């Protein structure tokens, strides 16, 4: 907790960090987000759709510290990486989210869990993983690594165009 301190370790300005904290605290008033809180947030964004499973994968992406529940400090740095951070940080974060078991690699069924997790929270019947792996895997052994993911996203200029769109808050 520190407005001047976070201004250094993030890319957001003093004015943005205030808006982001207000936006954060309004969802968990000194409660510090847990899995349930995430579910309630994305349920509000997506009506008639169960967001339980995705909230679980999203919560597992956090927690580097102690209490399990992710604090604002870790909430905002993750958001700093996603909105302002370099391309090898945004993709690195996305890759970290796709790797559920947290063991360096993304597999067919692992990816299938996440595609199902988004489809459930809200034309190919969940098997859009087949299109994903065919144009992301260099080895073609059913495993996409970090280095494999980073270089494969560079080749599709359409992703880089959307990922570097620059999204201001406030």
């Amino acid at each position: 907790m520190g407005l001047e301190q976070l201004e250094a370790q993030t890319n957001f300005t003093k004015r943005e960090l205030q808006v982001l904290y207000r936006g954060f605290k309004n969802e968990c008033p000194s409660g510090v987000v847990n899995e349930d809180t995430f579910k309630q947030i994305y349920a509000q964004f997506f009506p008639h759709g169960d967001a339980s499973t995705y909230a679980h994968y999203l919560f597992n992406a956090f927690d580097t510290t102690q209490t399990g529940s992710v604090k604002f400090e870790d909430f905002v740095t993750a958001l700093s990486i996603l909105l302002r951070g370099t391309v090898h940080e945004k993709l690195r974060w996305t890759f970290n989210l796709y790797d559920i078991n947290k063991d360096g690699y993304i597999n067919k069924e692992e990816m299938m869990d996440i595609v199902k997790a988004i489809y459930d929270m809200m034309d190919t019947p969940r098997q859009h993983v087949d299109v994903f792996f065919q144009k992301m895997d260099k080895n073609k052994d059913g495993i996409v690594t970090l280095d494999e993911f980073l270089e494969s996203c560079q080749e599709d200029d359409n992703i880089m165009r959307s990922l570097q769109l620059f999204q201001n808050v406030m």
Partner: protein
């Protein structure tokens, strides 16, 4: 609104720019639009973020109906209504739940809710007991 980049992150790679639903791209450039709206109720200057009024668009303060109460000369919405019950009406936009003040009269309270276009069926379970019983 700034919780979306997390939802957006889990879609990068398998559905980018292809179709999407409501996430991807902060469209229309609606940013920086959040200012402190001043709501003058009976002299009492209430102040709220304009996004807080936007929460429930199907009401007077939610829709463009409030613009009939706007004064361009003082740059504020003036309401010739009770300042006390308005605090509850305004708090509904903030907390998400409509609270009935125990001290106020049910008739006066219902009259004010009818003005701002909030239905009494929204009163939370927190004081639904109090509201029903005091309405005989």
């Amino acid at each position: 609104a700034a919780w979306l980049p997390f939802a957006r992150a889990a879609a990068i790679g398998w559905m980018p720019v292809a179709n999407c639903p409501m996430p991807l791209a902060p469209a229309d450039k609606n940013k920086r639009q959040d200012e402190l709206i001043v709501l003058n109720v009976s002299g009492r200057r209430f102040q709220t973020w304009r996004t807080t009024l936007e929460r429930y668009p199907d009401t007077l303060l939610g829709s463009t109906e409030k613009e009939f109460f706007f004064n361009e000369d003082t740059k504020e919405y003036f309401f010739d209504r009770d300042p006390e019950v308005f605090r509850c009406v305004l708090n509904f936009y903030r907390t998400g739940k409509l609270h009935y003040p125990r001290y106020e009269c049910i008739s006066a309270y219902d009259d004010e809710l009818a003005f701002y276009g909030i239905l009494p069926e929204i009163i939370g379970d927190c004081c639904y007991e109090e509201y029903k019983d005091r309405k005989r």
